[PDB]
Amino acid sequence: PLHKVPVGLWKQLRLWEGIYSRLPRHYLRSLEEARTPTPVHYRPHGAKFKINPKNWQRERVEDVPIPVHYPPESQLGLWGGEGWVLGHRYVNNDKLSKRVRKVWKPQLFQRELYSEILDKRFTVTVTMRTLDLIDQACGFDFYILKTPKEDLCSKFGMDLKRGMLLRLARQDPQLHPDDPARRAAIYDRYKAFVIPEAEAEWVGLTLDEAVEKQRLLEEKDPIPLFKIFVEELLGQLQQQALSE
Amino acid sequence: ATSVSWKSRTKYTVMPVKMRKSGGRNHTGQIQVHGIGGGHKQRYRMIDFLRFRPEHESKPGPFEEKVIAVRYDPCRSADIALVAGGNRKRWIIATENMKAGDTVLNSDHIGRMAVAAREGDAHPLGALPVGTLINNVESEPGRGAQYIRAAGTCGVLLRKVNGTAIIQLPSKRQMQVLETCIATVGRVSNVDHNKRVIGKAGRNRWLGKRPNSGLWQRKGGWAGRKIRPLPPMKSYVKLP
Amino acid sequence: AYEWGVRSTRKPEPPPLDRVYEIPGLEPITYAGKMHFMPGLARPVFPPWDPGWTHPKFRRLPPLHEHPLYKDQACYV
Amino acid sequence: AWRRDIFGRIIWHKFKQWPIPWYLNKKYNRKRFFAMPYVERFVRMRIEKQARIKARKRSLERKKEKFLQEKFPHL
Amino acid sequence: TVIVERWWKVPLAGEGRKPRLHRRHRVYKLVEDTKHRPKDNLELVLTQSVEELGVRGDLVSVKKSVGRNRLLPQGLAVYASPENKKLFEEEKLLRQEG
Amino acid sequence: GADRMSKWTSKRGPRTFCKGRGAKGTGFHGRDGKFVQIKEMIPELVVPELAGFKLKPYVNYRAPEGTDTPLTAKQLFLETAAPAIEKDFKAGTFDPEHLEKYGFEPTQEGKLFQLYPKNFPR
RNA sequence: ACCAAAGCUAGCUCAACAUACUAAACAAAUACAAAAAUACACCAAAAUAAAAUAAAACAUUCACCUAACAUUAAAGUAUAGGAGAUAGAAAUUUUUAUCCUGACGC
RNA sequence: GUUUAAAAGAACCAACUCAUCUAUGUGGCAAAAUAGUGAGAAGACUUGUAGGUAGAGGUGAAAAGCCUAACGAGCCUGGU
RNA sequence: CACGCUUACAUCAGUAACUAAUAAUAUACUGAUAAUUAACAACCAAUAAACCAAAACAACACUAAAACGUUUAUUAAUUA
RNA sequence: UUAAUUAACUAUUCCAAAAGUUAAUAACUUAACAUGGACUAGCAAUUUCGGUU
Ligand SMILES: [Mg+2]
Ligand SMILES: [Mg+2]
Ligand SMILES: [Mg+2]
Ligand SMILES: [Mg+2]
Ligand SMILES: [Mg+2]
Ligand SMILES: [Mg+2]
Ligand SMILES: [Mg+2]
Ligand SMILES: [Mg+2]
Ligand SMILES: [Mg+2]
Ligand SMILES: [Mg+2]
Ligand SMILES: [Mg+2]
Ligand SMILES: [Mg+2]
Ligand SMILES: [Mg+2]
Ligand SMILES: [Mg+2]
Ligand SMILES: [Mg+2]
Ligand SMILES: [Mg+2]
Ligand SMILES: [Mg+2]
Ligand SMILES: [Mg+2]
Ligand SMILES: [Mg+2]
Ligand SMILES: [Mg+2]
Ligand SMILES: [Mg+2]
Ligand SMILES: [Mg+2]
Ligand SMILES: [Mg+2]
Ligand SMILES: [Mg+2]
Ligand SMILES: [Mg+2]
Ligand SMILES: [Mg+2]
Ligand SMILES: [Mg+2]
Ligand SMILES: [Mg+2]
Ligand SMILES: [Mg+2]
Ligand SMILES: [Mg+2]
Ligand SMILES: [Mg+2]
Ligand SMILES: [Mg+2]
Ligand SMILES: [Mg+2]
Ligand SMILES: [Mg+2]
Ligand SMILES: [Mg+2]
Ligand SMILES: [Mg+2]
Ligand SMILES: [Mg+2]
């Protein structure tokens, strides 16, 4: 026998059925789309066509992303969207020589980054590319709010983004209870990323966390049948009272 | 399975505690050091290597203790000595001529005049004469006597310059430390320990030394009389 | 000096708290609702359990100073 | 509660009476209600085995019906 | 950051399909290491009067080390973004007239 | 080799393997090593008085049976609370906030025999 | 004449459709040494596929090899290859709804 | 048990532990045994229970020994 | 007795054939019915303090430095 | 192994990265980790042993 639905669509079917269907539509549509992350380790070519130097003919070239491995320690820091490059290499850079497995690893650094919206200094394991992206975005909070999930590749970064988005959507007075002017000045410069509360609490959540949150939201105690029967009897009595 | 260490005892006690030997096996269970295992059952007598340790912090001055008994210790090659002062007793490493019913001084005071060095006495290096034989010397003030402890071994004080004392270890190497490091004077007990003669191959098994491997290995370049110069003086002073 | 406790035998320190507990104004999503550990969710922090009714055998030993016969002066018995 | 044990199956775990909460019980804490990433293949294998069993049972029933119709031509 | 390139050519896939990879496509050559290239300089706008660089209200090009460990954490300077530069422009315009 | 299909009971092990046969515990271990049995843990059989009880284990063979009507929650409600609530609503003193007079229980933790926790065996 | 011999069924196999995919039983006990009601915790982990084989040897290479894009052509073409064995696209094209499902299968 | 101021990796010799030599056995009682005869027998001794070290390894008083009756590197499954 | 096997144990009855490497019959096959009754054994307190001083008839010693414990203070459901 | 290609890991050393320090663009240091590229050795990995006689 054969399966009616291919194995590649089984996860999609489970996401469509069950409690996964009751999840918010904006979260679902954010999870479905798989955007190609920015090239970090492989250098892409600009144009889509290229002239072969040997064939002297135009051919369509494409970019294939190089698989990069993210160890579980990367989810606790901000490595800038990079990780471990596991692959092979030719010793002495000769094809006809030996093939050798090689693991290229990034240079991690324990740096302390200060956030303006959350007002806390986090001791995070960041990379030089992370610091460069921060300097390019002209701010830690700017970098967090601008780089998406596919470019962060960090659960901690997604949690930071969710926290600052919730703070911006709630206008939290706990930022600076003694400096309302400073709080307002901080909240104004991040106005371009203001997201409503209905979507600000579902951005840095995984599938398991989202299912757990939906279960905690839908967790209702079973009402006793006494209440339902009393309501039915009251309805019947009101009907018999109005039908006379 | 991973084994736990027997050294789980935070409270210092004078009574001997039972210890679980392990023959070359690390906490994993594989041999790390060959030729170890199957010795005699031994207890552990906890030694207090920080000699200058007052009972209460209210009186941090020097103190005198009395030697009760010089006993044998199966864990080290030296002899241990029970010393009592105040309300507590402690095991220390007995010197060459330390007998029962002696008085030992433990001081941390340095003065312009050198003190007369007895055996059981323990003064900082800055207070001892320039040619004094010492043992149980320290690296940092208050760290504890990691250095000379073996039976009969003793170092010698060479000179004191710029509030820093230079000593010479039994390995004929020079060690520079601060002058406030406490050190015990004299030679360690059991000076005839090197002259002992293992009578038979069974005494090694009693001590807990398994026989060497029977594999014949050809000598490499490492073998031969390597006449190397004396290494430079090991300094422990942190110069800013 | 020389501390008499070995780290591998002492009570190991609690694991570091999850990174979601350092974000101000953010509720952690833990596994406390399912009454069991589940990977991917945060570690819930629980307050010290209060057995509203005391049990003689299964209670913590009261301290020495709580005893009514406790005195400041040390007696040598 | 409807739990998922280490074997990937969905079970109905009944609750027991305990004098201490769930986060303080040693015997209960070393239990696992979740499946590791290596149990998905076994779950799919169970699914395929049950599918094959049902398919061959349906084919057997069809063959029996056809045999009976051919043996009794009362139509 | 290490930059690697495949030794072997990957066949095409034009319908948006994922490229069919092989074991031979895991062989990489290290074509560049960004950590070894001469690093660029960070431009920062002073918010206070420091002794070495100069008076508050100027753009200076300092190395990323000092720009990240001294000027930015201590609030001694800010980035050179347009939104942060308009403020200093209007401050200079208010200062020159008075 | 040993057997795997047979049940693993207490008779098949060493002296230090003493597994119970399914009985419930009746106490704990005291001070001197003995067993202290708690009289609250032992089941108290509540036996009624069968002296003047005119009912036998069997019924008359000529007695007729009845159609199977499994008792339901709606039927029980109609039998115990529908007349009372109907009379109360006809009299006009119906209180939707207080339903304890009709037999409803807000919280089970007050009474002795609760229904959801099932504090009683039988 | 013994030993023996012959049944036609239990059922299987390959497909189509298909609800959409870990069956039924789960009173109590079941990850204490499973099926043992009952005490102050610890819980969790990832780091490339390899080789047998072909190149009549074997070192670079060796389709499939438990990762969806299917079909008709382009096309075994451009290309990639100790330029050897072999590997191998794409741009661009075609694909009319349902029943008619059973068996030159045992 | 005996000899010894001796519990001396001493001596004689039991239980016990090994297995020197011979004869049977060789699809045998036995996939290593029987009988006689031997060596140690207070020690580097035998032995009960429970745990650990796992194969690109472990362990080894090196016999390239032993790691569940075939180990110059176990067995099972898959590649096949 | 411990470890291990689980009824192969006990009574009655039958054995033409099945098990005993053959019979007689039966602890080893078959069927029915019964049985092993706790005093022995298993499960059967923590938290701090005083505690250096071997077991070998242990008087006292040797070296290889040696398992085996009480008392005091606070809490230990209390009921065949 | 004095065979041919050379990995991972462990010990050296060097350069780069990172942290910094001095003076009116230069010089200098690295506690624990630790990334990239080279060097010398251990531990080692893959494969082979032309044919007529
Ligand atoms: Mg020793
Ligand atoms: Mg000694
Ligand atoms: Mg030797
Ligand atoms: Mg030798
Ligand atoms: Mg078996
Ligand atoms: Mg038993
Ligand atoms: Mg038994
Ligand atoms: Mg009793
Ligand atoms: Mg070949
Ligand atoms: Mg061939
Ligand atoms: Mg060959
Ligand atoms: Mg071959
Ligand atoms: Mg292959
Ligand atoms: Mg070429
Ligand atoms: Mg060729
Ligand atoms: Mg195409
Ligand atoms: Mg002898
Ligand atoms: Mg014999
Ligand atoms: Mg004879
Ligand atoms: Mg004999
Ligand atoms: Mg003899
Ligand atoms: Mg002899
Ligand atoms: Mg074991
Ligand atoms: Mg090999
Ligand atoms: Mg080996
Ligand atoms: Mg040899
Ligand atoms: Mg040989
Ligand atoms: Mg074998
Ligand atoms: Mg048996
Ligand atoms: Mg017979
Ligand atoms: Mg019988
Ligand atoms: Mg060579
Ligand atoms: Mg190869
Ligand atoms: Mg070889
Ligand atoms: Mg040849
Ligand atoms: Mg030849
Ligand atoms: Mg010839």
The Cβ of residue F107 has, within 10 Å, a number of other Cβ atoms equal to 7
Percent helix, strand and coil across chain C, each to the nearest 5? 5, 5, 90
Q: Count of alpha carbons within 13 Å of D59, Cβ hemisphere only?
A: 7
Establish whether chain B is in contact with chain F, requiring a minimum of 3 CB pairs below 8 angstroms. no
Q: Is B44 annotated as a binding residue?
A: no
Look-up of token digits 């990240």: E68
Number of domains chain B is built from: 2
Query: Taking CB atoms and an 8 Å limit, are E27 and A114 in contact across chains?
Result: no
Pairing of strands B174-178, B234-235: parallel
CATH number at residue B55: 2.40.50.140
Using left for φ > 0, alpha for ψ between -120 and 50, and beta otherwise, residue B172 falls in left
Nearest CA to B166 out of B222, B226, B125 is that of B125
Structure tokens at F5: 């299909």
Give me ligand 14 centre to Cα A95, in Å.
9
Contacts of A233 in chain F (CB under 8 A): 82, 85-86
Q: Are the C-beta atoms of residues A35 and A148 closer than 8 Å to each other?
A: yes
Question: Do B103 and B3 share a domain, yes or no?
Answer: yes
Sign of dihedral through CA atoms B182, B187, B193, B194?
positive
Nearest CA to C30 out of C16, C46, C14 is that of C46
d(CA A229, CA A25) in angstroms, rounded, equals 36
Nearest-by-Cβ selection for E27 from A62, A87, A138: A87
Breaks (C-N over 2.5 A) in chain E follow: none
Give me ligand 15 centre to Cα F17, in Å.
72
Give kind and range of the element (H or E) at residue B98. Answer: none
Contacts of D31 in chain C (CB under 8 A): 36
d(CA B232, CA B230) in angstroms, rounded, equals 7
Q: Which of the four CATH numbers 3.40.5.10, 3.40.50.970, 3.40.50.1260, 3.40.50.740 does domain E42-98 have?
A: 3.40.5.10
d(CA A128, CA A107) in angstroms, rounded, equals 8
Question: Do B95 and B177 share a domain, yes or no?
Answer: no
Question: Do B13 and B42 share a domain, yes or no?
Answer: yes
Nearest CA to B31 out of B210, B223, B171, B169 is that of B210
CATH number at residue B165: 2.30.30.30
Sorted by where each begins, the domain ranges of chain A are 1-244
Q: Is A82 on the interface with E (CB under 8 A)?
A: yes
Nearest CA to D34 out of A219, A13, C18, C37 is that of C37
The b/e string for B152-175 (b: 16+ C-beta within 10 A; e otherwise) is bbbbebbebeeebbbbebeeeebb
Nearest CA to C35 out of E96, B30, B177, D1 is that of D1
User: Could you give the C-alpha distances from A48 to A37, A62, B64, in angstroms and in order?
Assistant: 18, 7, 90
Q: Count of alpha carbons within 13 Å of B240, Cβ hemisphere only?
A: 0
d(CA A116, CA A186) in angstroms, rounded, equals 7
User: Could you give the C-alpha distances from B238 to B27, B124, B126, B159, B161, in angstroms and in order?
Assistant: 35, 18, 18, 19, 15
Q: Are the C-beta atoms of residues A22 and A202 closer than 8 Å to each other?
A: no
Contacts of A43 in chain E (CB under 8 A): 3, 5, 31-32
Question: Do B145 and B99 share a domain, yes or no?
Answer: no
Angle at E73 between CA E68 and CA E76, to 5 degrees: 95
Q: Residue D12: which residues within 8 A CB-CB, separation 6 or more?
A: D1, D2, D3
Question: Do B18 and B92 share a domain, yes or no?
Answer: yes
User: Could you give the C-alpha distances from F21 to F14, F18, F24, F25, in angstroms and in order?
Assistant: 16, 9, 9, 11
Q: Which amino acid, one-letter code, is at B79?
A: D
DSSP one-letter code for B31: B
Q: Is B72 annotated as a binding residue?
A: yes
Helical H segments across B184-240, by residue range:
201-207
Nearest CA to B73 out of B42, B38, B39 is that of B42
| Within a domain: B214 | no
Question: Do B42 and B131 share a domain, yes or no?
Answer: no
Provide the shortest C-alpha distance from residue A87 to chain C (in Å): 28
Q: Is F86 on the interface with A (CB under 8 A)?
A: yes
Pairing of strands B88-93, B174-178: unpaired
Q: Are the C-beta atoms of residues E50 and E31 closer than 8 Å to each other?
A: no
Question: Do B95 and B143 share a domain, yes or no?
Answer: no
Q: Residue E40: which residues within 8 A CB-CB, separation 6 or more?
A: E64
Crossing angle of helices F73-80 and A225-242, rounded to 10° = 60
- For chain A, the chains sharing at least 3 beta-carbon pairs closer than 8 angstroms are C, D, E, F
DSSP one-letter code for A95: T
Question: Do B129 and B164 share a domain, yes or no?
Answer: yes
Domain that holds residue B181: 108-188
Could you please report the per-residue DSSP string of E36-62? GS----EEEEESS--SSS-SSS-EEEE
Domain end (from B107, B132, B157): B107
Question: Do B116 and B150 share a domain, yes or no?
Answer: yes
Look-up of token digits 């999609």: A12
Question: Do B148 and B60 share a domain, yes or no?
Answer: no
Pairing of strands B234-235, D2-4: unpaired
- The 3-state DSSP class for residue A102 equals strand
Nearest CA to B161 out of B58, B56, B52, B237 is that of B237
Domain end (from B107, B132, B158): B107
Q: Which amino acid, one-letter code, is at A36?
A: T
Give kind and range of the element (H or E) at residue B229. Answer: none
d(CA F33, CA F83) in angstroms, rounded, equals 61
Q: How buried is A124 (Cβ within 10 angstroms: 0-12 exposed, 13-18 middle, 19+ buried)?
A: buried
Question: Do B61 and B143 share a domain, yes or no?
Answer: no
The answer to whether the C-beta of C39 is closer than 7 A to strand G is yes
Nearest CA to A150 out of A47, A43, A70 is that of A70
Experimental method: cryo-EM
Give me ligand 33 centre to Cα E11, in Å.
25
Q: Are the C-beta atoms of residues C2 and B49 closer than 8 Å to each other?
A: yes
Q: In terms of C-beta distances under 8 Å and separation of at least 24 residues, what long-range contacts does A208-214 make, across chains too?
A: A208/C38, A208/C40, A208/C41, A209/C29, A209/C40, A209/C41, A210/A23, A210/A27, A211/A19, A211/A20, A211/A23, A212/C29, A212/C31, A212/C33, A212/C34, A212/C41, A213/C29, A214/A19, A214/A22, A214/A23
Which residue gives the smallest C-alpha to C1' distance to G47? A71
Question: Do B9 and B91 share a domain, yes or no?
Answer: yes
Q: Residue C44: which residues within 8 A CB-CB, separation 6 or more?
A: C28, C30, C31, C32, D23
Angle at B127 between CA B124 and CA B131, to 5 degrees: 105
Task: Spell out where F1-122 has E strands.
Answer: 27-29, 35-37
Establish whether chain E is in contact with chain C, requiring a minimum of 3 CB pairs below 8 angstroms. no
The b/e string for F9-46 (b: 16+ C-beta within 10 A; e otherwise) is eeeeeeeeeeeeeeeeeeeeeeeeeeeeeeeeeeeeee
Crossing angle of helices F73-80 and F82-91, rounded to 10° = 50
Give me ligand 3 centre to Cα B212, in Å.
6
Structure tokens at B226: 């390597």
Nearest-by-Cβ selection for A129 from E1, E67, E68: E1
Give kind and range of the element (H or E) at residue F44. Answer: none
Q: Residue E7: which residues within 8 A CB-CB, separation 6 or more?
A: A90, A95, E24, E27, E28, E29
